[PDB]
């Protein structure tokens, strides 16, 4: 052949191949740096307020009207523990059970960390002796049940996108069973603007597809404990895997507040570790492929 032209595809092949090597070296330097920063841990000095009660609600009736960390003792049998309290939002008295705002805490953990509780309850406000700002944390499946079986308890799910818009998901009745029942969730009496993802499912789905995204009446599932409504034989084909972490999964979710924290908001299938829509997802508002900047879950007695 006379004009056997292109090694340009090979020159472009080499240019991209050498570009990847520089990025591999870039990522090598970034990981090696954090390996040195993790020799010493972060420190907080959260001085415990004098006012106590059974939940963030009893405190506001006793006089605790500032949004910070409080020490609660639901029952005399159970050990007192630290929890963040919202005293400003909607009359106050909200017991924060879940908080997302940054990416400072991993939410893809085992059955035990979700049982006990992981993350940071509250972080220090600068120039202050008390921790007024909340941190990313899951209170613990054992702590939440009780906090819903002590009486009628309402759930408030608040979320914010990456440009300032705020929506709410409020439920009148909210009960989670104990470990013996695999922490089975029960929600009723919906009210809000975010969309009913727990009871109804995703809005952009029809028939069975919407039905299999319903969270109401589903068991808790971590990546070491398969309890979802997804019947399969393949070990990889689980809802807790390929998604965020521990959540009341079905087939698999319409809402994933315990998901991977994606920066910016917009993420795609090729960006995801396994291809599925993991991350802080609420389909009834933004869809499957958008991660929320803020996501919080809080509980309160319904008298």
């Amino acid at each position: 052949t006379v004009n056997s032209n292109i090694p340009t595809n090979l020159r472009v092949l080499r240019s991209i191949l050498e570009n990847l090597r520089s990025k591999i070296q870039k990522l090598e330097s970034d990981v090696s740096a954090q390996m040195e920063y993790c020799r010493t841990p972060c420190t907080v000095s959260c001085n415990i307020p004098v006012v106590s009660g059974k939940e963030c609600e009893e405190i506001i009736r006793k006089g605790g009207e500032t949004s910070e960390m409080y020490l609660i003792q639901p029952d005399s049998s159970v050990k007192p523990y630290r929890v963040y309290c919202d005293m400003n939002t909607e009359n106050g008295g909200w017991t924060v059970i879940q908080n997302r705002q940054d990416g400072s805490v991993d939410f893809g953990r085992k059955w035990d960390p979700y049982k006990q509780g992981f993350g940071n309850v509250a972080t220090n406000t600068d120039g202050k002796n008390y921790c007024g700002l909340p941190g990313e944390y899951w209170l613990g499946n054992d702590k939440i049940s009780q906090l819903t079986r002590m009486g009628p308890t309402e759930l408030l799910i608040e979320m914010e996108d990456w440009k300032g818009d705020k929506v709410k998901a409020h439920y009148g009745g909210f009960t989670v069973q104990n470990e013996a029942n695999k922490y089975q969730i029960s929600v009723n009496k919906y009210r809000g603007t975010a969309g009913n993802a727990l009871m109804d499912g995703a809005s952009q789905l029809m028939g069975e597809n919407r039905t299999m995204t319903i969270h109401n009446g589903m068991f808790f599932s971590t990546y070491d404990r398969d309890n979802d409504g997804w019947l399969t034989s393949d070990p990889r084909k689980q809802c807790s895997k390929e998604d965020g972490g521990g959540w009341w999964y079905n087939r698999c979710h319409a809402a994933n507040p315990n998901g991977r924290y994606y920066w910016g908001g917009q993420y795609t299938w090729d960006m995801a570790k396994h291809g599925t829509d993991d991350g802080v997802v609420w389909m009834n508002w933004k869809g499957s492929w958008y991660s929320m900047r803020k996501m919080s879950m809080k509980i309160r007695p319904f008298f």
Partner: peptide, 4 residues
């Protein structure tokens, strides 16, 4: 998401 949904698993068909």
């Amino acid at each position: 998401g949904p698993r068909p």
